[PDB]
A paper describes a structure:
RdDM requires two plant-specific RNA polymerases known as RNA polymerase IV (Pol IV) and RNA polymerase V (Pol V), and a number of accessory proteins with different functions. All together, these observations have positioned the DDR complex as a key component that acts downstream of the methylation readers SUVH2/SUVH9 to recruit Pol V to RdDM loci. We report here the structures of the Arabidopsis Pol V recruitment complexes DR (DMS3-RDM1) and DDR′ (DRD1 peptide 7-DMS3-RDM1). The structures of the two complexes are similar at their core—two DMS3 dimers bridged by an RDM1 dimer.
Using single-particle cryoEM, we determined the structure of the DR complex to an overall resolution of 3.6 Å. The cryoEM structure shows that the stoichiometry of DMS3:RDM1 is 4:2. The two RDM1 molecules in the DR complex form a dimer at the center of the complex. Surrounding this RDM1 dimer core are four DMS3 molecules that form two dimers, each binding to the exposed sides of a RDM1 monomer of the dimer core, opposing one another. In addition, the two DMS3 dimers bridge to each other across the RDM1 dimer core using two CC arms. Interestingly, while the two DMS3 dimers are similar to one another, the two monomers within each DMS3 dimer differ in their structures: one shows both visible hinge and CC domains, while the other monomer has a visible hinge but unresolved CC domain in the structure. DMS3 dimerizes using two hinge domains in a hand-shake configuration, forming a donut shape. Our cryoEM structure of the DR complex also reveals numerous interactions between DMS3 dimer and RDM1, with a buried interface with an estimated area of ~31% of the RDM1 dimer surface area. Notably, both pockets are occupied by the CC arm of DMS3 in our cryoEM structure (inset 3). We hypothesize that the DR complex might represent an early intermediary complex prior to the formation of the full DDR complex.
Author numbering:
A (entry chain A): 39 to 161
B (entry chain B): 39 to 163
C (entry chain C): 52 to 99, 117 to 139, 147 to 405
D (entry chain D), E (entry chain F): 117 to 139, 147 to 352
F (entry chain E): 52 to 98, 117 to 139, 147 to 405
Write the structure that this text describes.
Amino acid sequence: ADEGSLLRRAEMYQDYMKQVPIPTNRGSLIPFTSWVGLSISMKQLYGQPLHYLTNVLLQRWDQSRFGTDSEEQRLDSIIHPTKAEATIWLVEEIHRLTPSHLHMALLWRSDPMYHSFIDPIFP
Amino acid sequence: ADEGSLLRRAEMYQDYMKQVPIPTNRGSLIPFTSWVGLSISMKQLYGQPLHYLTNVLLQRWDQSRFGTDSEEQRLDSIIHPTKAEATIWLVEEIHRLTPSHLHMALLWRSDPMYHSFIDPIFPEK
Amino acid sequence: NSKRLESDLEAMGNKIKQHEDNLKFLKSQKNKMDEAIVDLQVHMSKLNDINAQILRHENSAAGVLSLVETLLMLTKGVVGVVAKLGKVNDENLSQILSNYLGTRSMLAVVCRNYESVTALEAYDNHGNIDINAGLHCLGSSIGREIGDSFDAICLENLRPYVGQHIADDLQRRLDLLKPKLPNGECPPGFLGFAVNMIQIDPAYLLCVTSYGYGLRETLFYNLFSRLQVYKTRADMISALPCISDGAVSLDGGIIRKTGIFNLGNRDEVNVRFAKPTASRTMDNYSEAEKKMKELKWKKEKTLEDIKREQVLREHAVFNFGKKKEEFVRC
Amino acid sequence: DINAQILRHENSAAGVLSLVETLLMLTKGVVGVVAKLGKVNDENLSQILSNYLGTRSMLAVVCRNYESVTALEAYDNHGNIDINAGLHCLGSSIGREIGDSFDAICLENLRPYVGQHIADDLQRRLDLLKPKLPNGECPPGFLGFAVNMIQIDPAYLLCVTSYGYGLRETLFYNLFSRLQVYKTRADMISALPCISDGAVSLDGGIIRKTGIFNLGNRDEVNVRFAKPT
Amino acid sequence: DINAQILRHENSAAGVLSLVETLLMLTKGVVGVVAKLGKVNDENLSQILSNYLGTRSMLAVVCRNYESVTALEAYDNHGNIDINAGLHCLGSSIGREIGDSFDAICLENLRPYVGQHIADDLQRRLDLLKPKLPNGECPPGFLGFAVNMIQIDPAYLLCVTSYGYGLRETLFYNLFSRLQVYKTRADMISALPCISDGAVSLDGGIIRKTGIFNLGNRDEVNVRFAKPT
Amino acid sequence: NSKRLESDLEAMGNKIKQHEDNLKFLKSQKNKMDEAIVDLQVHMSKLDINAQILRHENSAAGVLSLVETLLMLTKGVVGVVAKLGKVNDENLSQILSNYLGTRSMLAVVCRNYESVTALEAYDNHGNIDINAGLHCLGSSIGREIGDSFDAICLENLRPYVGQHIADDLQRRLDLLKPKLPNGECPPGFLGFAVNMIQIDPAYLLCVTSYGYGLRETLFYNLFSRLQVYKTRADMISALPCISDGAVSLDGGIIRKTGIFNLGNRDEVNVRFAKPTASRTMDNYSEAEKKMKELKWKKEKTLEDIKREQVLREHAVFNFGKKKEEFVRC
């Protein structure tokens, strides 16, 4: 009962995120502390959600910096925010067009409460 | 005895990858079929390794496409190769400058034979 | 080719039919969620000092809200006050955390969305506060007026803790990498982080924010950002290179940043975090309340997916109608 | 006059040091009071930056090393701050006492801003990144960064700490850590995604962090930054 | 003459259909032989594309639908190909027999090249992406794609299959699926990271896939593509 | 100004001593690996297809098999495709050999591309000189190589970009089974052909420089996602399910989706070998694959030594220039 339900949810969500267009103008420069900070800002300057895989990847990029004392090193000194927005738009285009719903249904079968990465916003 | 060797190896590897520069001229068009094919062809044109985390990410992207009948679509037609080459260069710059070796040593501890992803390509000469 | 377009139109018909089937699927699952939440409502219906310290601060807005709780949409939007939401076991460490926060961040009002922030205040063309604002109208209607600048926190705009959690336990407390000497060990007087000290009400552990975040991950992580608690003062200065942003001694002085130190006669704060009262029956009732809040959050997420699929179905309707009109015109 | 404004807060230690300056190694190690070190061209912007910092960090004593911090206060085995401390003996000998906690900043242990400066401008203004909307240039109400608003004494621009860092890099960076200054409250709310740390509206209310909104009848702080002369 | 080259391979079925064409529904459904359908301007490039495809796919019969494939051959319950099949009865009635396996391409079940075309050029050449080195333009030996080298009969450019696809989109795309043609063997090896499917060197050896290198004394194929007239 | 410069080269000397300690640790690890492989090597030292290759006299595989019955050329070559894979039954081996054809069946396979370059020599005319390595060796011992032959290098092969079956021996690749539009599988489907080959367990892992197997590199690039169907009518009945290739266990084969073979099936005399029923050879081969894994990990630790050597040399040069800059100031 859970298998077909999660497979259908994955197919529907991938159809919608396939439907959404990447925006036209990208000339912006958001000062930012963490990756999830830039994503939460960039979901507000643009009226567009991000993919599930993009939110999960940005949380893992944020957790990949913990430990060694570069947390106190401010991130936008390392990465110019034009480059960071370019990475998030290109990685979101990859996660919108290419992936299958079988892989994503497997990932949703791994964890419940997976809605923490699906955005409520929609154009 | 295991975890100290893992941590010191991860620290040495992370220092070596932070040492590596990202190249100046990146204007090329590589017709490609899968992500790993692009990574291999781009390691061969640009004599530079990729990170461990970059190769893990590209394999997981390439496994994410299995399933739905999208393998019959050539990935060259879905994503223009200049775009995807720019994605892989910028994600490599993220994985080179930002990471701490403690998390990477945790990931190396989680599975043996982690040298499958570490490239023997040296930028010297 | 006409035959290709006719086959494609039949394919679009199959697509629109599977869209309406997906709609029926989601409507059925939403009805299941409604059944479960009404069952939990009737079960919860079957299962059925800090206020003085708030009211001493007569000029501040927390006293206004507490006096209204003794006696509109503002009380719908506002979650509560920071002093009400936290509970600390011992008297001493509660007083020291109150001294760290101060009487402004302690008396802050917390509300869900930013429109609930704009509901509290009304500004003129000049920008000055006009009494037509909600809290000002209501406080002037009941009594005292708000001269003190009070603080408003919206939970949606807060930067969530982008980090892992401790898996095996209740209270969802936050694992962070403990401070370390440049060679030796952890510092000796270390007593724990302070964000883990606050015992959260189990109604607010999950599904408060629309993303599903807890209250420790959002509110008290932003008020208590990675500060360490140390047992004695000399242990605290002894651990000077090891500390992040804040640090607190359990005897005396507190420090705010890495270089900033505090010293002098310690200004106390009247309001305090309460001591939690562990009663098993109210624990079970608040467990049912937690289950209620989690069910309602999943119902809201299914409803958002229903809106999403309605958008897709309307796009398919428009495209099918346009293509069939172009085909008939061809 | 600013020294009268310091001396109004009689329970402080800044009024005690001002009373010393009108009439030991304490006043040798101490660089001075924060409100003495910063000058602001106009009046309204000075008032709102003072309301941002508050009367506790505005009256902070500023010393160089942590040895000066140990010189200011003395602790016994009881853990209590007795009279035998530095400024407590000094205030008991001269006059008013210190019953409020006050802030003691040491410039050695602070975090310096290791970022590129503007090359040609005086006062060594910070080369900090300005936000931009998705369409074009800067947000509509953007007046600029508050750490570069402070007009400073030219004696303190270089070699104040032991490493040769200035005072804008150490003190005012750690007090005003990249916060925008906006002309209008509506222009501050409309540019809320671009502000990183904090924002200060030139007519009314301010925000310390991202989610935290300060609002209501504006509580004033009696101490302000001086006029530049 | 190309029909003599078809008739040299007497054990084929293409020689059988050529002997029919010199003298049923088999020759009604069959579009024809691959070497008859393609024309190449020069001689060397035709020889090396013929060496690439081999004498088995070069002598392939090409029919439209799978019903024509069922018309060509008949299977009994034994599973053996008896005489009672189409071309076996036809060859037994006319002359030579068919002892070699031969290739039967159906144009309906093939994978059409559903990608953009060049707008202005005749023969509907494919709009395919050309590789580029990291410095500048194309690799140094790049002569171009082999599916666009084929000069085709203008009767077969449109509506050959039922969906209106051409013959370059279906047959020659599925025989020459994006393989580069390079002038020099060293220019083929030096541009090895950019070649996706295959590469053909205009003097010598070729590669079918990425890791697979063909080398040694060059085995020739007697059948070639025709000259264009 | 001077104190931060002093702390800079102080910390730089601390880092270069850290480099030297890390070098010594890795030399310790390499020597422990050397001790383990010497112990297992003395533990190991303490304990027809060739006629079918030799019927192809003009082929280079017959040349290499004849020279093995009697340099750097035959050291780089891993082997011949007919001698690497093994199939239990005879019929399926005949059909897979008919599928691959006698040019790729007699393909030499070597590790590195330099071994491909060593096999042949080309002049400015491009003609194949006798001065080529295999042509010198064949002419020196006898018959010449007039047939074109295939040369696979294991480094440039695109490895299967996918998962395996974890618990199962011989590392059988899991691929997605073909699916009807209905929920069922096609009935004739026995398996993919690349899982059918039973492989020598010495070649299961670390053959490649990346540690890739041989089923990943060689047999996936030969037998790429094709099906093996029991009867012919099963293969025609499941045509929309098939994607890359199909092979019937009764008769004919199809290379692509639309390309059909039909007619009298030309046989291939070179076949896959049948497996060996002995058991002690399997124990020796397990010792061999343990040796190969230890050799691969030793090579990787040597490369890690090379990385750290590059780090210490650059750090020494930076330390010398920084000492000169501070003494000059």
